[PDB]
């Protein structure tokens, strides 16, 4: 009775939210951008091929200097590369082989990794002795670590397979904030450029917008049919894109509280593992399970071009802060730099 | 330039050389060691099988290292993960084998049907299509006790058991009852129906009747892993 009442209340509240979102849908984004010129044909080429990972690369993160990058493979190595010269700067052996995520601190002083050991480990790259050693182990999660992103040197937001996200204080090692509300495994997170909010995509086919200081979910976005593997903010912070196992990418607006565009094709029936934007946000780059990456017109939903240099599944994608290069990692143990 | 740029490039090529020298040794250790994923339910007997390998030689994953005939094996057991496994199972694609332990006596209402559904999902997953499964139908003593007691019937939970007959290629143990043998090979053929239907994959299934305390479980793993790697080697020499 009471539980039934609560269900019917939540159902009429979902109908109120759906009608309020439909009241703002005066005209679509494709109708707005139907009279702008198209980007043409983007023909990016492979400039570098980083080699040296024994096993499949799960995750890659660009540093803020747009030159050094970190890559995590399941052989137990973190490799920090120098993408200009293809030299290797660091090779960190991990305690747990089964890593699933890596992150580069914006200061370049730290890297983080985690995976099936349910721990986020912080490695200090600027030690006094010069060797790379583990600085902190964050062990509060009860599921696999799927994504982590530094806010600064002392803060990091993690997403986990225990349906929760967390905000950590690295100096004390404790969870300062727990972000609860997702029902499925949270697969990816993306910080806003001001780092006051972040979005998280999960296996409940939903993305949530979270306030970092308040610790509450502000908005919930739906529209994807299956598990969301990837999420990335638009450069101005007022939109974000998602990649899911329903073979579609979707653009959601924060202020309109709904989806603006679907990036899909009938020849694609494979899931998206990673998404990223270009510097102006005009191009949406998505990595796919059929070993290719697609470059989409983010304003017209046209497929601008194909990055087709990998033999196994493309697992991670990153665009530099200056917008010069795209890095794609894959399950064939290779990182490729394109432009 | 040559003032500082040459010195920096020299230092970064020497650091890349020292890293590649460490990664050749790590490539040899990676290639020599064989990795196994141990899967099973909470009452399948897998914990006893780990304790049995550990006597001879909350965390998100547990590791057991054992050596057979100077061949190193690392077996990974999953703990403190949720029961939703469609994401993290994709990490185990590259392992030599998945050791799937099933309590065969548990024919929840039907733990054997749940193990068959989990085996079907593992077998037909798009990322695990080249990963071989070593299948341990465990607790053959409890299965023999329940079959010879005659209280619980397999025909209630598996109605096609009544039309089942023991295969002519069966090799029963000496002194084993024929009803126990027919129940063993029906439980084995339920998994082998799944394993022998899915095409376009480089996976093989190796079923074994086992009890948790068998000394020879590790040898059963070794002889299966020796065949899996052999098949992989043969792939290098394939023509068409």
């Amino acid at each position: 009775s009471e539980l039934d009442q609560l269900r019917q209340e939540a159902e009429q509240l979902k109908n109120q939210i759906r009608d309020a979102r439909k009241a703002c849908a005066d005209a679509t984004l494709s109708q707005i951008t139907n009279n702008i010129d198209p980007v043409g044909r983007i023909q990016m080429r492979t400039r570098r091929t980083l080699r040296g990972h024994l096993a499949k690369i799960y995750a890659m993160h660009w540093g803020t200097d747009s030159r050094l990058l970190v890559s995590a493979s399941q052989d137990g190595k973190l490799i920090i590369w120098d993408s200009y010269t293809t030299n290797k700067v660091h090779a960190i052996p991990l305690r747990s082989s089964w890593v699933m995520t890596c992150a580069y601190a914006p200061s370049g002083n730290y890297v983080a990794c985690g995976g099936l050991d349910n721990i986020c480990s912080i490695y200090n790259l600027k030690t006094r002795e010069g060797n790379v050693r583990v600085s902190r182990e964050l062990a509060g999660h009860t599921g696999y670590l799927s994504c982590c992103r530094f806010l600064d040197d002392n803060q990091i937001v993690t997403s986990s397979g225990d349906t929760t996200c967390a905000l950590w204080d690295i100096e004390t090692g404790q969870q300062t904030t727990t972000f609860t509300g997702h029902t499925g495994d949270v697969m990816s997170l993306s910080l806003a450029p001001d780092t006051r909010l972040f979005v998280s995509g999960a296996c409940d086919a939903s993305a949530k917008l979270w306030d970092v200081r308040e610790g509450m979910c502000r908005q919930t976005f739906t529209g994807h049919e299956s598990d969301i593997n990837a999420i990335c903010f638009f450069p101005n912070g007022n939109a974000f894109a998602t990649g899911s196992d329903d073979a579609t990418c979707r653009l959601f607006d924060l202020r309109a509280d709904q989806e603006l565009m679907t990036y899909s094709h009938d020849n694609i029936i494979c899931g998206i593992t990673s998404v990223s934007f270009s510097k102006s946000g005009r191009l949406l780059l998505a990595g796919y399970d059929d070993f290719n990456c697609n470059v989409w017109d983010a304003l017209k939903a046209d497929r601008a071009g194909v990055l087709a240099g990998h033999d196994n599944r493309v697992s991670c994608l990153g665009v530099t802060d200056d917008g010069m290069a795209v890095a794609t990692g894959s399950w064939d143990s290779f990182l490729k730099i394109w432009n | 330039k040559t003032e500082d740029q040459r010195n920096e490039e020299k230092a970064q090529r020497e650091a890349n050389k020292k890293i590649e020298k460490q990664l050749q040794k790590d490539k040899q250790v990676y290639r020599a060691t064989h990795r196994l994923l141990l899967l099973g339910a909470g009452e399948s007997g897998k914990n006893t099988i780990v304790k049995q390998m550990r006597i001879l030689h909350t965390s998100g994953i547990f590791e057991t290292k054992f050596q057979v005939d100077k061949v190193n094996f690392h077996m990974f057991d999953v703990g403190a993960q949720r029961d939703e496994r469609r994401k993290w199972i994709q990490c185990f694609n590259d392992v030599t084998a998945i050791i799937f332990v099933v309590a065969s006596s548990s024919y929840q209402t039907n733990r054997l049907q749940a193990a068959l559904k989990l085996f079907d999902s593992i077998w037909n997953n798009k990322w695990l299509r080249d990963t071989s499964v070593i299948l341990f139908l465990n607790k053959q003593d409890l299965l023999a006790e329940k079959v010879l007691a005659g209280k619980s019937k397999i025909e209630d939970y598996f109605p096609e058991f009544a039309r089942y007959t023991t295969p002519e290629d069966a090799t029963p143990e000496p002194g084993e009852d024929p009803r126990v043998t027919r129940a063993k090979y029906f439980i084995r053929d339920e998994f082998l129906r799944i394993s022998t239907a899915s095409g376009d994959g480089r996976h093989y299934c190796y079923p074994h009747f086992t009890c948790s305390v068998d000394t020879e479980n590790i040898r059963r793993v070794f002889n299966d892993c020796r065949d899996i790697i052999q098949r992989m080697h043969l792939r290098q020499y394939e023509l068409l």
Partner: nanobody, 128 residues
Framework: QVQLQESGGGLVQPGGSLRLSCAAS????????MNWVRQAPGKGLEWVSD????????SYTGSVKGRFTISRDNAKNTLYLQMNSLKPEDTAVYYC?????????????????????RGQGTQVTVSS
């Protein structure tokens, strides 16, 4: 939003029949393998039946085989389950579950405790 709504349950005498229905919205229904699972009181979730995308491949669990029939209508986005010859062991909350990814042969986690692509479930009680 992915939404699944079960209906058609209730109380029946033993030997009776029921027809359960699952109305699906928020996804392309013809791209997914569908499932029926159930949860008896005091027990865990138990898989009952599944049907493939085209309806050609159909499987049941052993205790309901010959009594339960699963079917789908892709035009109406509806999943049906005809439960003839009901026993008191069939008293359960019956859930309509969707396989998590389209165009896949495998189907993980549909009997998990907190699976997302599963409806609220309808109660079927078989008693005298």
């Amino acid at each position: 939003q992915v939404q699944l709504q079960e209906s058609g349950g209730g109380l029946v005498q033993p030997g009776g029949s029921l027809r359960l229905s699952c109305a699906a919205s928020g996804f392309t229904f013809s791209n997914y393998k569908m499932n029926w699972v159930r949860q008896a009181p005091g027990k865990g979730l138990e898989w009952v039946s599944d049907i493939s995308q085209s309806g050609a491949s159909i499987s049941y669990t052993g205790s309901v085989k010959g009594r339960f029939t699963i079917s789908r209508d892709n035009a109406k986005n509806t999943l049906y389950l005809q439960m003839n010859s009901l026993k008191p062991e069939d008293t359960a909350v019956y859930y309509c579950a969707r396989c998590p990814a389209p165009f896949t042969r495998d189907c993980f986690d549909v009997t998990s405790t907190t699976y997302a692509y599963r409806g609220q479930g309808t109660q079927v009680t078989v008693s005298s």
